[PDB]
């Protein structure tokens, strides 16, 4: 034990020295050659009503016109974001839900929560209705989020400190990703769909390879547990939000931290993050009941989106980049442009 | 209007969906929700049974009221990531055991008091009253004839009799409330013979309902 721990310490010293070896320049010294974007103002264009309890997640379609939301009513709702119509309303067998997803082809939806099961629903039948195609079981802690890869492969992360890759038609797992110590909070797929990232309650993130299962890299730096994560549009960076009122931008190739987003006037945690196409705006929810907009390259600017009366718990951006949607703990979804 | 016929059919569909959502939302707000909590070997299996993986939910009816009680003992994670979603519940049932006033795990009773203090002063439950159940009093009555309470209460200086011990213990539970102006605490000595338990819970819920009504009207 003593020799193994000493060698582990030596290896950690090697890793820290390798990370600190190539740190020659930082963003703040070379981003001073760009004009600031200026004041950014957005206006509520539509308002979607109908949920009754708090709202916990949502996900855009790939045609940038259809939308799905989940609340603790025990209801999953599909919206037309152009004319504020309702297309489908799906009832649940367990109302303690925390996540949802929207299949990339547009055929299926998924949900889960405090019951240790992920349910998969088929939207296009010959009988007019929506039915439960599949029930994936096998975890022992609650589910955090789930994201489709295609019509036949799904990825889940739980509070067991484990992630899993599932083959839908068979119903059994294919590979399990272990190595975390605390609860896993969220994950984000790569645009080219070969890797992903995962953040945990132990204040650390890890990069996973889908088809073999070996963790490639790990990242630390936050002072407390991690709450949200996403990829940069080119699939070569990522941004994390935590419970100590700070956001951070990491790059895979540099294998260390790049930049931080914090302000003195904020004392609450971050509940979700997202990006925009050119990677020039970073949108982040908070507990102050409102959302902020940061300039990614400079991190000394902001726009504000206010109009909710409780914690902003989810937000999202389309594939064509022409709208933003937010949902909060007071049952209303809002669309901004 | 500047719409086709298919779009008007779509609008009709949306209105029907809205009507159904509102009907279900009216229906699902007339039932009493209870959250059940305890410690290890707290004797709450009897509490579950006598009252007519993941979360386990049970339903019953009594005197034209519909009770849903949620048991969440099988979750093995930190409560900070999970407890906020029970914020709107109507009451909390809490189970403890009297017979374990001297056992060692340091003491069972001490950790039970720390748990009670932890969930009695939390910020999500500043307005929700608490029901308390005291279990396994018979073995406690048989054990006191051999060991005094000083083994766990060195400062206790009363008789080694059942009634004084029971009243004492109830007092150091009911002492832990720091919000006496907002929420009350009800207690009961668990009788494992008949259906008095459901009657006690029913009376406590009725009081909670009445006082909430009066609070809302600014009265």
């Amino acid at each position, epitope marked *: 034990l003593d020799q193994l721990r000493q060698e582990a310490e030596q290896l950690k010293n090697q890793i820290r020295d390798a990370r600190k070896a190539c740190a020659d320049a930082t963003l703040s010294q070379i981003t001073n050659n760009i004009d600031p974007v200026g004041r950014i103002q957005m206006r509520t264009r539509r308002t979607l009503r109908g949920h009754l309890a708090k709202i916990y997640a949502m996900h855009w379609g790939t045609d940038s016109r259809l939308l799905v939301s989940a609340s603790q009513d025990g209801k999953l709702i599909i919206w037309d974001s152009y004319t504020t*119509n309702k297309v489908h309303a799906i009832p649940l067998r367990s109302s303690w839900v925390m996540t949802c997803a929207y299949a990339p082809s547009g055929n299926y939806v998924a949900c889960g929560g405090l019951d240790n099961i992920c349910s998969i629903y088929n939207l296009k039948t*010959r*009988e*007019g209705n929506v039915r439960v195609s599949r029930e994936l079981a096998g975890h022992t802690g609650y589910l955090s989020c789930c994201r489709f890869l295609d019509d036949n492969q799904i990825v889940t992360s739980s509070g067991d400190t484990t992630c899993a890759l599932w083959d839908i038609e068979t119903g059994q797992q294919t590979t399990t990703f272990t190595g975390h110590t605390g609860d896993v909070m969220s994950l984000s797929l790569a645009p080219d769909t070969r890797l992903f990232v995962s953040g945990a309650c132990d204040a650390s993130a890890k990069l996973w390879d889908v088809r073999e299962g070996m963790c490639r890299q790990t990242f630390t730096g936050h002072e407390s547990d991690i709450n949200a994560i996403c990829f940069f549009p080119n699939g070569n960076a990522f941004a994390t939000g935590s419970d100590d009122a700070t956001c951070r931008l990491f790059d895979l190739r540099a294998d260390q931290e790049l930049m931080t987003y914090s302000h003195d006037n904020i004392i609450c945690g971050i509940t979700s993050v997202s990006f925009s196409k050119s990677g020039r705006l970073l949108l982040a929810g908070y507990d102050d009941f409102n959302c902020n907009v940061w300039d990614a390259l400079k991190a000394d600017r902001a726009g504000v989106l206010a109009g909710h009366d409780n914690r902003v718990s989810c937000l999202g951006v389309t594939d064509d980049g022409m709208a933003v949607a937010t949902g909060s703990w007071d049952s209303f979804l809002k669309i901004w442009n | 209007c500047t719409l086709s016929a*298919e*779009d008007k*059919a*779509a609008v009709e*569909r949306s209105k029907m969906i809205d009507r159904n959502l509102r009907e279900d939302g009216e229906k699902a707000a007339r039932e009493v929700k209870l959250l059940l909590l305890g410690a290890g070997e707290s004797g709450k299996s009897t509490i579950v049974k006598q009252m007519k993986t993941g979360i386990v939910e049970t339903h019953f009816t009594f005197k034209d009221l519909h009770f849903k009680m949620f048991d969440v003992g099988a979750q093995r994670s930190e409560r900070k990531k999970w407890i906020h979603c029970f914020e709107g519940v109507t009451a909390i049932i809490f189970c403890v055991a009297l017979s374990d006033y001297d056992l060692v795990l340091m003491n069972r009773m001490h950790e039970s008091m720390k748990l009670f203090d932890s969930i009695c002063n939390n910020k999500w439950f500043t307005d929700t009253s608490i029901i308390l159940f005291l279990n396994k009093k018979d073995l406690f009555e048989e054990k006191i004839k051999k060991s005094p309470l000083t083994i766990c209460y060195p400062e206790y200086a009363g008789s080694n009799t059942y009634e004084e011990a029971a009243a004492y213990i109830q007092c150091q539970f009911e002492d832990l409330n720091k919000r006496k102006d907002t929420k009350e605490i009800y207690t009961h000595f668990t009788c494992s013979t008949d259906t008095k338990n459901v009657q006690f819970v029913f009376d406590a819920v009725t009081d909670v309902i009445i006082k909430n009504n009066l609070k809302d009207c600014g009265l």
Partner: single-chain antibody
Amino acid sequence: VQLVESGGGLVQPGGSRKLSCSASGFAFSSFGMHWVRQAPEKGLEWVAYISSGSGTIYYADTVKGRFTISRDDPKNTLFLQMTSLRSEDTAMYYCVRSIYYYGSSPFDFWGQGTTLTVSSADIVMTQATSSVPVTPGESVSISCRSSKSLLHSNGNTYLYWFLQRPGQSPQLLIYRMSNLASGVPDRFSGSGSGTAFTLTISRLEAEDVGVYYCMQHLEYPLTFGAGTKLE
């Protein structure tokens, strides 16, 4: 999916009848329903439309005050109550299905129909040809013409192409003027510009012979074409 009708037969002048349709195998109470008519030797003619939730009813122009349409959800049954008959009402009747929301495919399943024999600001659609002789292995094109623009401000274009093989009920080929139906081979297509539209078929096969129709759904009433024959 199964729609079975009854009520047909021989009726004397005057009189009345009640035709019924029975569904089985799908969520009946989410689909709007139509009654459609076919003359013994002529094309098709829309008759009546009833909505979901029984909120809306539409009749044809030559039936108002004579025909009445009704539905019943608990037993999934459709009724047409029809009175004061005349010699111009000897035909066959089909019952058809549709469902409207963003992206759906109306007019997908057609019943089998039943026979009944007794002893203007509308839009006009014209089937230009009458009959075309062709040989298998080649490609064919058919066209029909309109009397008004069919494109709408929101981008849609409400033209429908249907097929009818000998001795059978029709089926949907192309809905909303460009989109392919469910279960139709990937060798049909259609296009067109304002008031003039063209369907095309490639590599003609056997059992791909019969009468083709084009319909519009811009506003009520619904008007069918004359009917093309391919042989």
